[PDB]
Request: fold
Amino acid sequence: NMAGRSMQAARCPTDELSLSNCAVVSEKDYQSGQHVIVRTSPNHKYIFTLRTHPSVVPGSVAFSLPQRKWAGLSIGQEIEVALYSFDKAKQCIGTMTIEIDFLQK
Amino acid sequence: EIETRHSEIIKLENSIRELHDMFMDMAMLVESQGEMIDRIEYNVEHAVDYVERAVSDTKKAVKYQ
Amino acid sequence: GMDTSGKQAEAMALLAEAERKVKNSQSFFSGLFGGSSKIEEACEIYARAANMFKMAKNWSAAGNAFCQAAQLHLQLQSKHDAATCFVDAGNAFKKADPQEAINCLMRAIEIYTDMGRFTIAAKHHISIAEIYETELVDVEKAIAHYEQSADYYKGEESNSSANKCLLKVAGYAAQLEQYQKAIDIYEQVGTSAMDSPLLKYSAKDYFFKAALCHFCIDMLNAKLAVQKYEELFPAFSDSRECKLMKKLLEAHEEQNVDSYTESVKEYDSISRLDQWLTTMLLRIKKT
Amino acid sequence: GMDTSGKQAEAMALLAEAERKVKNSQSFFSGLFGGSSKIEEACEIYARAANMFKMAKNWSAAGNAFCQAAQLHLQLQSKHDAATCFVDAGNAFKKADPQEAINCLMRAIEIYTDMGRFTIAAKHHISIAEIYETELVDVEKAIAHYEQSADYYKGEESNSSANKCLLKVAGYAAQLEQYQKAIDIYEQVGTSAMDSPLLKYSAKDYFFKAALCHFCIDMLNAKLAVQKYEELFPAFSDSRECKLMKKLLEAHEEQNVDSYTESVKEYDSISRLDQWLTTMLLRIKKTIQ
Amino acid sequence: RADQLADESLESTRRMLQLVEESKDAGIRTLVMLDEQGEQLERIEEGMDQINKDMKEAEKNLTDLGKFAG
Amino acid sequence: ESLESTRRMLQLVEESKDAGIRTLVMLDEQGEQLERIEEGMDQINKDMKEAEKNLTDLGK
Amino acid sequence: KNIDSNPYDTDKMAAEFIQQFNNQAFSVGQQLVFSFNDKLFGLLVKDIEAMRQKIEVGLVVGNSQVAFEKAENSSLNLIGKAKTRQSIINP
Reply:
């Protein structure tokens, strides 16, 4: 976890977890709230906040479709995950701008 | 002008069809050649092996003498 | 004709005085111990009786004679002659009953691999694979034979034969829905064919088939895969295949059966399709 | 797999058997003086061990055994067999160690050319150049090997092979080496096909390449050579390449990079590039000032 | 607009006729070429099989003669 | 009529192309094979010359 | 993925429902999948009336009667008598 471990990408099991924007991991592997860095290559790391789910098989992390098309992920692809710790004194979001549009035309 | 274009289209049709026939004949002849080269490969390799073992055995027999 | 059936009768009689030759082996070679050439001419009459049978269209008898001649001749000597006789028996058995042809061909394969002659062994492996396919239904044994023959061919840099064998294997595996091996093989062969100026025109078809196979498993990564194909080969998008695949994948985003139905009908309107592509599309586009 | 492990086990056993056999042969030559059958049978054991070892899928020791057997065989005044074993060992090492493969292949080349066979020597030279350039990054030695192969081919009026080798050499030189040799080779090969049986309409491209090379040198040489070819080969007058070149020449004359860019874009739109003309055209555009 | 129509149409006829003639001479020439290697490889068929028969029979007779001498 | 004629033209041209590509592949296979057969022929020639000459010399 | 504009006969569905679900417990708000003319539909029990006293949980029997009303803002076109529309004017 701290150093990072190899994981198999899986599909999100529930719609709610898909809407939660959090990576779904097994309680045996992680806990909910944990921030992990997903490494697909030396130059591609993506930060996700974890949410454990009983349906998630250990050794795999579930991601929703928008997460998959953002991180360029494939279900069943190998990823390396290491727990990440924020510098709350510096990494707490004061103001952030969001571009929003209707999801379905 | 348009009459010349009709002549051109007629000529092009003729040429395309006879090109098709030629190409088909090419393919037939080529595949035949491939088959029979294969048979020759087989026979040549067999001759190579037989004659190599032949020379080996003959030289061993001469050594026995 | 009929008189040649009578002479095949006296050719069973020829095998019969070959049986008298093995009766010599039983009792008379005690005084004819030096008659190893007598055994050789017995094998020769065996082979020629087998040839008269063959001309007489008696495939079972010709194969029996060939196998007996091979067994008698393979007295730990003249092994290559025994291998030739075994392959001749296998060819005779090809028609009618081919099962024992498999065993004789395997024995010849072992003899040749013992000798090291890998082109002959691999072509015989292709022969047994194709007779399995055309006569029997087992495909896994054909797949293993094809893999073995392709390995032997690639051993001696015979790249094209291995490439075609792997193309057939990938096609069969795709029919057997094991898409990882198929995509591996198709990508390999396409990226190899594009290397040299003699085959660069073929790459499009291999890339299209690999794209279809990849698209079968994961919709989402299909777009990334096709983008990778495009960027790797700038001259791929122009091809009608890439445009059609893009149309199909973008249409799949919206649940409209028509879109892809008329896409495929229009594409077929310029050229006919094969069983493999039509079946694959029918299976995949169901969902 | 059982097949592998068994193949390596029996190969080690056979190698030990061959070593003890050769030592006992050294002993017996003085002890009994049986001639040379002992060494020959030891070489047969070595060859069988090496072939089943390369069959075990392991290569380096296979080629090493081939080299040892060939050395011991040539020790008995037998040359062609040793050279064939050298070639096989080099082929085996091709995927194991380039240096030893190159050494053995050069040995085979020298010994063959000593025998009197050129085409085999030229083929080995081409293979050496291919392996040298494909994985090792260098050209000059490859250029030399290709030139030698072409020379040997022309020695036996093998026009096609020497033509291809010289064309490749000229292309590589134009890429990196200076241009005069490219000019000469390209022009000679192109003009040596005016009466080709199938290639009557081939030399055109070659001339264009030459023209480009000439244009890479200077504008005046470009135009003068262009005219010379215009008179020499009437058909080139009506080639699309002639009009493209003339348009590029007149555009670069006035120093309007936009005209050159649109011309090259229009050519690319009509016809796909080749990845060799684009580099030369970029280099030409680099010097518009 | 008929001007560019006539221009492109003349260009089309010229190119199509020329290109067809090039394809045609190419093909006819090559087809005439094929037969030569056809019969050449036939004749190597025959020469080779004669070699094979002769050497096989020679070697077998010589082995028999050597056995007779020994 | 010209429209359907050009449809025919397209179909014929693409068909000829598709088949010719395989024609070329086959011819490449033929060329690939011939060098191996040539090497085997030269090897047997050398072996026969040396063997027969050595045997004849030994006969003396 | 299987949405279509084809009409679906409610009366035949009602018979199929009785045929499929007769003698089975049903509760208000229950969700189930129903197979009708090889088409899968999602059904939600909205109201249940005893054989006119209102009941919370009931048993479907052969003589039980079915009245259909399409879901809010649904495009389903219900025909037949076993029913009981949107205002063309904005609410």
Notes: The first helix of chain F runs from residue 2 to 59.
